[PDB]
Amino acid sequence: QIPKHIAIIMDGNGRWAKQKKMPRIKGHYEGMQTVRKITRYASDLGVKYLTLYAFNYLMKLPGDFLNTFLPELIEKNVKVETIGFIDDLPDHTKKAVLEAKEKTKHNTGLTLVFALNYGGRKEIISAVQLIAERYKSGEISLDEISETHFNEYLFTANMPDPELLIRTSGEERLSNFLIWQCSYSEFVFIDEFWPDFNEESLAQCISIYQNR
Amino acid sequence: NINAAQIPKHIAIIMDGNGRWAKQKKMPRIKGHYEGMQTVRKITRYASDLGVKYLTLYAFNYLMKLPGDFLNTFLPELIEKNVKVETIGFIDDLPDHTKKAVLEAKEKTKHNTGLTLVFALNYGGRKEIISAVQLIAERYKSGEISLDEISETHFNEYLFTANMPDPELLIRTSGEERLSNFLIWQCSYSEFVFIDEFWPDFNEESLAQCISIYQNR
């Protein structure tokens, strides 16, 4: 019935403000508010994993969201995780991330995942490198290099493939996001910019997924 | 629709809805297959005229003989139309009947220089990537390549589409908004166009429409 894993490529924060004739900081503010509302709603719906990918300012959104609403996440049993090369992020951003993961590592509710400094192809390349290492070492046989064991070398090793993939602001591209993981996912593209995405908007996407 | 440098070099299509098209038209499923085959010929001609350089088609025990026989009957026209036939997938594991038709089609068109028509037969996105990993793992164990040589740059060399540009446009019919384990690595930045009509009803206008949309109108 309800998807266990929903992934969202979010953007349109800049365009939203431009069209609305408001400063960037205003779109940034609403953007964070949307992340908060969607996180609570998904948790209530019973969703288990929610992966967010913010496609300058959007670069600050994750860190800013975590530093500002962590107490709320802790309260609502949300566990924070990430995918991507986090050790290469700006210090103050890396700080917020590490702190959020540490303080939510024991929560058992919805796992909120932020894709930071992430890329589908590079993720694949990294896995290949690891697999090559193990093979040359004799740890595995050439027969063990199957699509069943491949997920074990990806960032999403401890999580299921998204049943549903959503992208805002119209745009109909994958943008090098979750290449291997979304190979069978349902793609739902909506025209609304991120700041306008709400609970109702999310239900429609799920409705579509279900009714198909 | 701007015919200029706005025409995609590589268009990939996931052919769907041959069966559903037949049931609606209250006809046997086999008739949907043939109407869909006719659609393949129409589009190949049209695409060739538009200037498209690559066209990859992905279909989505007589059934095992259908792909091979379609080629045998279409080959004469492909030859004179200057179309070059290619394939992606493990054709080596295809039935002798179809394996033969395929190998003959590539041989008799290898010198053509117009549109390159690619048939995804016995193809799987994940499986393709796994095959490339094994090749690379073997090359690494043998000591022929260094760990640093395993980059996104060199990865295309181990895929079936090594000598091909990633598609700029990917189309799927039957209004089913979902990627089906097809050109996983190659479609990272491709534009997706999900059209509602069934493959048998898909035509030149539909293709033109998709391209118009690709051109961001």
Side-chain angles (χ1 to χ4, degrees):
Chain A
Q1 186 196 0
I2 295 291
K4 295 181 295 185
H5 189 177
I6 297 175
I8 309 179
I9 298 180
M10 56 190 216
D11 64 337
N13 281 33
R15 281 163 288 167
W16 181 86
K18 180 178 173 298
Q19 179 172 300
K20 287 289 180 181
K21 292 173 283 64
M22 293 190 251
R24 297 179 74 195
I25 190 67
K26 173 58 168 177
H28 184 64
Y29 177 82
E30 297 300 315
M32 287 194 279
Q33 292 298 329
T34 302
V35 176
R36 200 229 296 219
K37 288 181 295 180
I38 294 304
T39 299
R40 292 191 297 224
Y41 183 54
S43 185
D44 293 339
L45 288 185
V47 177
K48 297 294 180 61
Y49 296 85
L50 179 65
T51 305
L52 299 178
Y53 179 40
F55 188 70
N56 197 345
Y57 245 71
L58 279 288
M59 167 186 75
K60 307 156 187 166
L61 190 152
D64 277 5
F65 175 75
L66 292 174
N67 281 337
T68 308
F69 302 97
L70 186 53
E72 190 176 320
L73 297 177
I74 291 174
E75 282 279 279
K76 235 164 298 300
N77 202 17
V78 174
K79 173 168 164 51
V80 177
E81 273 289 355
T82 56
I83 58 176
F85 300 71
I86 58 178
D87 214 84
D88 308 74
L89 294 173
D91 305 305
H92 43 103
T93 306
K94 190 195 304 182
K95 183 178 182 177
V97 179
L98 297 181
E99 196 174 309
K101 291 166 78 173
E102 189 61 45
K103 294 184 182 175
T104 59
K105 62 188 294 184
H106 292 115
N107 284 354
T108 61
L110 167 124
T111 310
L112 175 66
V113 184
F114 281 94
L116 304 170
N117 192 215
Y118 171 82
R121 291 179 173 192
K122 196 168 184 178
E123 174 181 39
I124 300 278
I125 290 308
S126 290
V128 179
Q129 295 180 319
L130 261 38
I131 304 182
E133 278 290 89
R134 309 200 67 193
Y135 186 58
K136 190 194 187 69
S137 296
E139 295 175 34
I140 61 177
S141 66
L142 203 62
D143 302 65
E144 298 189 87
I145 299 175
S146 69
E147 50 182 280
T148 312
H149 286 152
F150 197 62
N151 298 73
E152 301 174 16
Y153 302 84
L154 303 172
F155 282 117
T156 59
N158 303 320
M159 43 191 116
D161 296 340
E163 295 103 302
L164 171 61
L165 174 67
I166 302 175
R167 176 153 189 167
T168 63
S169 308
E171 311 150 299
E172 298 162 285
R173 300 187 306 290
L174 216 68
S175 290
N176 192 25
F177 180 62
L178 263 31
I179 281 189
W180 175 280
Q181 305 85 337
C182 293
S183 52
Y184 290 105
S185 306
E186 207 70 40
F187 306 149
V188 176
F189 306 118
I190 54 188
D191 288 80
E192 49 192 289
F193 293 122
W194 185 242
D196 291 329
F197 187 80
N198 51 53
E199 297 91 335
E200 190 67 66
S201 199
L202 180 62
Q204 291 188 355
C205 296
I206 297 181
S207 178
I208 295 176
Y209 165 72
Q210 293 183 310
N211 302 129
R212 187 169 62 192
Chain B
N1 188 302
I2 166 169
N3 207 306
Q6 297 285 327
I7 294 295
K9 298 189 297 178
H10 187 350
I11 300 183
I13 313 177
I14 299 179
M15 307 177 292
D16 208 9
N18 278 359
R20 285 165 280 166
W21 178 88
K23 74 169 184 179
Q24 296 298 303
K25 304 289 291 184
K26 63 190 75 65
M27 293 176 233
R29 205 273 171 65
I30 183 61
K31 206 161 188 65
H33 173 81
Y34 288 111
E35 257 296 304
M37 290 309 101
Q38 182 183 257
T39 294
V40 179
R41 298 189 297 254
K42 298 188 294 183
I43 300 302
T44 300
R45 297 166 181 147
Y46 188 43
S48 185
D49 291 347
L50 280 172
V52 177
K53 301 174 184 175
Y54 293 85
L55 182 61
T56 306
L57 298 173
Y58 183 53
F60 199 79
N61 53 14
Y62 68 99
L63 288 164
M64 308 292 97
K65 290 170 166 273
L66 293 187
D69 291 313
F70 166 66
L71 268 173
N72 285 335
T73 70
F74 194 26
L75 189 54
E77 193 180 346
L78 291 178
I79 291 179
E80 55 184 53
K81 252 60 153 50
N82 190 215
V83 175
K84 180 171 178 175
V85 181
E86 278 300 328
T87 58
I88 53 179
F90 308 83
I91 54 179
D92 179 59
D93 300 316
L94 284 175
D96 283 72
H97 182 98
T98 296
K99 196 199 308 298
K100 180 182 181 181
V102 172
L103 300 177
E104 176 184 85
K106 298 180 70 160
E107 190 57 37
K108 291 186 171 61
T109 54
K110 60 189 292 186
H111 296 118
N112 286 358
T113 61
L115 171 91
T116 295
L117 184 59
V118 186
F119 288 98
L121 295 168
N122 197 218
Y123 175 80
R126 288 193 171 176
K127 190 167 176 55
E128 179 186 25
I129 288 182
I130 289 301
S131 296
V133 184
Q134 295 181 317
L135 294 171
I136 301 175
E138 261 299 305
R139 298 208 66 210
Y140 185 57
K141 190 193 187 68
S142 72
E144 292 187 347
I145 59 173
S146 178
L147 205 62
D148 62 79
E149 294 177 62
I150 306 178
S151 61
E152 298 181 36
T153 296
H154 296 141
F155 195 70
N156 195 48
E157 307 178 342
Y158 302 85
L159 303 171
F160 290 122
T161 60
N163 298 117
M164 293 169 53
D166 300 337
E168 300 108 308
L169 179 62
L170 187 140
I171 301 177
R172 186 183 177 127
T173 57
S174 299
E176 190 64 2
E177 300 186 279
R178 161 184 52 103
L179 206 175
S180 294
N181 188 28
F182 180 62
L183 296 182
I184 282 180
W185 175 279
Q186 305 88 350
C187 292
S188 307
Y189 305 95
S190 301
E191 268 285 329
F192 291 87
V193 175
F194 304 103
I195 188 166
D196 219 276
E197 54 191 85
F198 297 121
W199 183 241
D201 292 323
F202 187 91
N203 58 29
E204 296 81 2
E205 303 182 299
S206 306
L207 182 57
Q209 195 171 119
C210 293
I211 295 173
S212 292
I213 297 181
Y214 160 74
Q215 302 170 334
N216 288 332
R217 281 70 175 222

mmCIF file with all atom_site columns, all heavy atoms in Angstrom, chain A residues 192-203:
data_model
loop_
_atom_site.group_PDB
_atom_site.id
_atom_site.type_symbol
_atom_site.label_atom_id
_atom_site.label_alt_id
_atom_site.label_comp_id
_atom_site.label_asym_id
_atom_site.label_entity_id
_atom_site.label_seq_id
_atom_site.pdbx_PDB_ins_code
_atom_site.Cartn_x
_atom_site.Cartn_y
_atom_site.Cartn_z
_atom_site.occupancy
_atom_site.B_iso_or_equiv
_atom_site.pdbx_formal_charge
_atom_site.auth_seq_id
_atom_site.auth_comp_id
_atom_site.auth_asym_id
_atom_site.auth_atom_id
_atom_site.pdbx_PDB_model_num
ATOM 1   N N   . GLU A 1 192 ? 5.064  22.024 -9.634  1.00 0.00 ? 192 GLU A N   1
ATOM 2   C CA  . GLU A 1 192 ? 5.268  22.936 -8.514  1.00 0.00 ? 192 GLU A CA  1
ATOM 3   C C   . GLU A 1 192 ? 6.679  22.988 -7.949  1.00 0.00 ? 192 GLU A C   1
ATOM 4   O O   . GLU A 1 192 ? 7.380  21.977 -7.884  1.00 0.00 ? 192 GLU A O   1
ATOM 5   C CB  . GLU A 1 192 ? 4.240  22.694 -7.406  1.00 0.00 ? 192 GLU A CB  1
ATOM 6   C CG  . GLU A 1 192 ? 4.075  21.258 -6.977  1.00 0.00 ? 192 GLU A CG  1
ATOM 7   C CD  . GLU A 1 192 ? 2.860  21.066 -6.093  1.00 0.00 ? 192 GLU A CD  1
ATOM 8   O OE1 . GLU A 1 192 ? 2.885  21.526 -4.933  1.00 0.00 ? 192 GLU A OE1 1
ATOM 9   O OE2 . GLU A 1 192 ? 1.875  20.458 -6.560  1.00 0.00 ? 192 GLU A OE2 1
ATOM 10  N N   . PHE A 1 193 ? 7.108  24.199 -7.611  1.00 0.00 ? 193 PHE A N   1
ATOM 11  C CA  . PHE A 1 193 ? 8.426  24.427 -7.043  1.00 0.00 ? 193 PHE A CA  1
ATOM 12  C C   . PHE A 1 193 ? 8.430  23.886 -5.626  1.00 0.00 ? 193 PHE A C   1
ATOM 13  O O   . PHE A 1 193 ? 7.378  23.763 -5.010  1.00 0.00 ? 193 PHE A O   1
ATOM 14  C CB  . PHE A 1 193 ? 8.742  25.917 -7.029  1.00 0.00 ? 193 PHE A CB  1
ATOM 15  C CG  . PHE A 1 193 ? 8.910  26.515 -8.395  1.00 0.00 ? 193 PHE A CG  1
ATOM 16  C CD1 . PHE A 1 193 ? 8.114  27.580 -8.803  1.00 0.00 ? 193 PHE A CD1 1
ATOM 17  C CD2 . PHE A 1 193 ? 9.881  26.036 -9.263  1.00 0.00 ? 193 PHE A CD2 1
ATOM 18  C CE1 . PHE A 1 193 ? 8.288  28.163 -10.057 1.00 0.00 ? 193 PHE A CE1 1
ATOM 19  C CE2 . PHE A 1 193 ? 10.063 26.612 -10.520 1.00 0.00 ? 193 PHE A CE2 1
ATOM 20  C CZ  . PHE A 1 193 ? 9.265  27.678 -10.916 1.00 0.00 ? 193 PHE A CZ  1
ATOM 21  N N   . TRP A 1 194 ? 9.611  23.589 -5.098  1.00 0.00 ? 194 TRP A N   1
ATOM 22  C CA  . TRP A 1 194 ? 9.721  23.033 -3.754  1.00 0.00 ? 194 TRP A CA  1
ATOM 23  C C   . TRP A 1 194 ? 8.940  23.752 -2.645  1.00 0.00 ? 194 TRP A C   1
ATOM 24  O O   . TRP A 1 194 ? 8.177  23.117 -1.920  1.00 0.00 ? 194 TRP A O   1
ATOM 25  C CB  . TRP A 1 194 ? 11.190 22.861 -3.356  1.00 0.00 ? 194 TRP A CB  1
ATOM 26  C CG  . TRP A 1 194 ? 11.344 22.187 -2.043  1.00 0.00 ? 194 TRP A CG  1
ATOM 27  C CD1 . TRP A 1 194 ? 11.922 22.701 -0.925  1.00 0.00 ? 194 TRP A CD1 1
ATOM 28  C CD2 . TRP A 1 194 ? 10.871 20.882 -1.687  1.00 0.00 ? 194 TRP A CD2 1
ATOM 29  N NE1 . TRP A 1 194 ? 11.833 21.804 0.110   1.00 0.00 ? 194 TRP A NE1 1
ATOM 30  C CE2 . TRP A 1 194 ? 11.194 20.677 -0.331  1.00 0.00 ? 194 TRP A CE2 1
ATOM 31  C CE3 . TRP A 1 194 ? 10.205 19.864 -2.383  1.00 0.00 ? 194 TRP A CE3 1
ATOM 32  C CZ2 . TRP A 1 194 ? 10.875 19.496 0.346   1.00 0.00 ? 194 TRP A CZ2 1
ATOM 33  C CZ3 . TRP A 1 194 ? 9.888  18.688 -1.707  1.00 0.00 ? 194 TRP A CZ3 1
ATOM 34  C CH2 . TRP A 1 194 ? 10.224 18.516 -0.356  1.00 0.00 ? 194 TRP A CH2 1
ATOM 35  N N   . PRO A 1 195 ? 9.090  25.080 -2.511  1.00 0.00 ? 195 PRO A N   1
ATOM 36  C CA  . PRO A 1 195 ? 8.356  25.784 -1.456  1.00 0.00 ? 195 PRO A CA  1
ATOM 37  C C   . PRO A 1 195 ? 6.839  25.630 -1.476  1.00 0.00 ? 195 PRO A C   1
ATOM 38  O O   . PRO A 1 195 ? 6.176  25.867 -0.468  1.00 0.00 ? 195 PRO A O   1
ATOM 39  C CB  . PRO A 1 195 ? 8.771  27.228 -1.674  1.00 0.00 ? 195 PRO A CB  1
ATOM 40  C CG  . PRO A 1 195 ? 10.172 27.087 -2.140  1.00 0.00 ? 195 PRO A CG  1
ATOM 41  C CD  . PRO A 1 195 ? 10.048 25.989 -3.161  1.00 0.00 ? 195 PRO A CD  1
ATOM 42  N N   . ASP A 1 196 ? 6.283  25.235 -2.616  1.00 0.00 ? 196 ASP A N   1
ATOM 43  C CA  . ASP A 1 196 ? 4.839  25.062 -2.716  1.00 0.00 ? 196 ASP A CA  1
ATOM 44  C C   . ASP A 1 196 ? 4.407  23.624 -2.526  1.00 0.00 ? 196 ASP A C   1
ATOM 45  O O   . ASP A 1 196 ? 3.213  23.334 -2.444  1.00 0.00 ? 196 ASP A O   1
ATOM 46  C CB  . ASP A 1 196 ? 4.322  25.585 -4.053  1.00 0.00 ? 196 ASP A CB  1
ATOM 47  C CG  . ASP A 1 196 ? 4.417  27.088 -4.163  1.00 0.00 ? 196 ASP A CG  1
ATOM 48  O OD1 . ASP A 1 196 ? 4.298  27.779 -3.122  1.00 0.00 ? 196 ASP A OD1 1
ATOM 49  O OD2 . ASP A 1 196 ? 4.612  27.578 -5.295  1.00 0.00 ? 196 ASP A OD2 1
ATOM 50  N N   . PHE A 1 197 ? 5.381  22.721 -2.490  1.00 0.00 ? 197 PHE A N   1
ATOM 51  C CA  . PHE A 1 197 ? 5.112  21.302 -2.295  1.00 0.00 ? 197 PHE A CA  1
ATOM 52  C C   . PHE A 1 197 ? 4.618  21.142 -0.859  1.00 0.00 ? 197 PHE A C   1
ATOM 53  O O   . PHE A 1 197 ? 5.231  21.658 0.076   1.00 0.00 ? 197 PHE A O   1
ATOM 54  C CB  . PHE A 1 197 ? 6.404  20.497 -2.518  1.00 0.00 ? 197 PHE A CB  1
ATOM 55  C CG  . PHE A 1 197 ? 6.217  19.002 -2.495  1.00 0.00 ? 197 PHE A CG  1
ATOM 56  C CD1 . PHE A 1 197 ? 5.733  18.331 -3.607  1.00 0.00 ? 197 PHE A CD1 1
ATOM 57  C CD2 . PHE A 1 197 ? 6.551  18.263 -1.370  1.00 0.00 ? 197 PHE A CD2 1
ATOM 58  C CE1 . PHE A 1 197 ? 5.589  16.948 -3.601  1.00 0.00 ? 197 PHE A CE1 1
ATOM 59  C CE2 . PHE A 1 197 ? 6.409  16.884 -1.358  1.00 0.00 ? 197 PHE A CE2 1
ATOM 60  C CZ  . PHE A 1 197 ? 5.928  16.226 -2.475  1.00 0.00 ? 197 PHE A CZ  1
ATOM 61  N N   . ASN A 1 198 ? 3.492  20.464 -0.685  1.00 0.00 ? 198 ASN A N   1
ATOM 62  C CA  . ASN A 1 198 ? 2.951  20.265 0.649   1.00 0.00 ? 198 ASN A CA  1
ATOM 63  C C   . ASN A 1 198 ? 2.419  18.856 0.841   1.00 0.00 ? 198 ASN A C   1
ATOM 64  O O   . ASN A 1 198 ? 2.599  17.990 -0.017  1.00 0.00 ? 198 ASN A O   1
ATOM 65  C CB  . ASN A 1 198 ? 1.858  21.295 0.937   1.00 0.00 ? 198 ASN A CB  1
ATOM 66  C CG  . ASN A 1 198 ? 0.808  21.347 -0.151  1.00 0.00 ? 198 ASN A CG  1
ATOM 67  O OD1 . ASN A 1 198 ? 0.233  20.327 -0.526  1.00 0.00 ? 198 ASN A OD1 1
ATOM 68  N ND2 . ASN A 1 198 ? 0.562  22.539 -0.673  1.00 0.00 ? 198 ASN A ND2 1
ATOM 69  N N   . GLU A 1 199 ? 1.758  18.638 1.973   1.00 0.00 ? 199 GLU A N   1
ATOM 70  C CA  . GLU A 1 199 ? 1.192  17.338 2.308   1.00 0.00 ? 199 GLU A CA  1
ATOM 71  C C   . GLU A 1 199 ? 0.262  16.834 1.211   1.00 0.00 ? 199 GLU A C   1
ATOM 72  O O   . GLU A 1 199 ? 0.422  15.719 0.718   1.00 0.00 ? 199 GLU A O   1
ATOM 73  C CB  . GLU A 1 199 ? 0.436  17.414 3.639   1.00 0.00 ? 199 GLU A CB  1
ATOM 74  C CG  . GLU A 1 199 ? 1.302  17.766 4.848   1.00 0.00 ? 199 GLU A CG  1
ATOM 75  C CD  . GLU A 1 199 ? 1.391  19.261 5.132   1.00 0.00 ? 199 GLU A CD  1
ATOM 76  O OE1 . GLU A 1 199 ? 1.201  20.076 4.203   1.00 0.00 ? 199 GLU A OE1 1
ATOM 77  O OE2 . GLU A 1 199 ? 1.654  19.622 6.300   1.00 0.00 ? 199 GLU A OE2 1
ATOM 78  N N   . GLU A 1 200 ? -0.687 17.674 0.814   1.00 0.00 ? 200 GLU A N   1
ATOM 79  C CA  . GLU A 1 200 ? -1.648 17.324 -0.227  1.00 0.00 ? 200 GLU A CA  1
ATOM 80  C C   . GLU A 1 200 ? -0.906 16.905 -1.492  1.00 0.00 ? 200 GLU A C   1
ATOM 81  O O   . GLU A 1 200 ? -1.180 15.860 -2.073  1.00 0.00 ? 200 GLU A O   1
ATOM 82  C CB  . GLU A 1 200 ? -2.556 18.522 -0.524  1.00 0.00 ? 200 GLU A CB  1
ATOM 83  C CG  . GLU A 1 200 ? -3.754 18.214 -1.421  1.00 0.00 ? 200 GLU A CG  1
ATOM 84  C CD  . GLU A 1 200 ? -4.774 17.297 -0.759  1.00 0.00 ? 200 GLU A CD  1
ATOM 85  O OE1 . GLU A 1 200 ? -5.403 17.721 0.236   1.00 0.00 ? 200 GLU A OE1 1
ATOM 86  O OE2 . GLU A 1 200 ? -4.953 16.155 -1.237  1.00 0.00 ? 200 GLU A OE2 1
ATOM 87  N N   . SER A 1 201 ? 0.081  17.707 -1.866  1.00 0.00 ? 201 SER A N   1
ATOM 88  C CA  . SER A 1 201 ? 0.886  17.456 -3.046  1.00 0.00 ? 201 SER A CA  1
ATOM 89  C C   . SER A 1 201 ? 1.555  16.079 -2.981  1.00 0.00 ? 201 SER A C   1
ATOM 90  O O   . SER A 1 201 ? 1.610  15.362 -3.979  1.00 0.00 ? 201 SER A O   1
ATOM 91  C CB  . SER A 1 201 ? 1.932  18.560 -3.179  1.00 0.00 ? 201 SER A CB  1
ATOM 92  O OG  . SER A 1 201 ? 2.442  18.616 -4.493  1.00 0.00 ? 201 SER A OG  1
ATOM 93  N N   . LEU A 1 202 ? 2.022  15.693 -1.797  1.00 0.00 ? 202 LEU A N   1
ATOM 94  C CA  . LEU A 1 202 ? 2.673  14.399 -1.622  1.00 0.00 ? 202 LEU A CA  1
ATOM 95  C C   . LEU A 1 202 ? 1.680  13.253 -1.742  1.00 0.00 ? 202 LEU A C   1
ATOM 96  O O   . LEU A 1 202 ? 2.011  12.190 -2.261  1.00 0.00 ? 202 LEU A O   1
ATOM 97  C CB  . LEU A 1 202 ? 3.385  14.318 -0.271  1.00 0.00 ? 202 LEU A CB  1
ATOM 98  C CG  . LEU A 1 202 ? 4.119  13.004 0.028   1.00 0.00 ? 202 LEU A CG  1
ATOM 99  C CD1 . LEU A 1 202 ? 5.229  12.779 -0.976  1.00 0.00 ? 202 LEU A CD1 1
ATOM 100 C CD2 . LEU A 1 202 ? 4.698  13.031 1.427   1.00 0.00 ? 202 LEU A CD2 1
ATOM 101 N N   . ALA A 1 203 ? 0.464  13.466 -1.252  1.00 0.00 ? 203 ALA A N   1
ATOM 102 C CA  . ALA A 1 203 ? -0.566 12.436 -1.323  1.00 0.00 ? 203 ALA A CA  1
ATOM 103 C C   . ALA A 1 203 ? -0.902 12.118 -2.776  1.00 0.00 ? 203 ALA A C   1
ATOM 104 O O   . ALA A 1 203 ? -1.078 10.958 -3.139  1.00 0.00 ? 203 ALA A O   1
ATOM 105 C CB  . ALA A 1 203 ? -1.809 12.882 -0.576  1.00 0.00 ? 203 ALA A CB  1
#
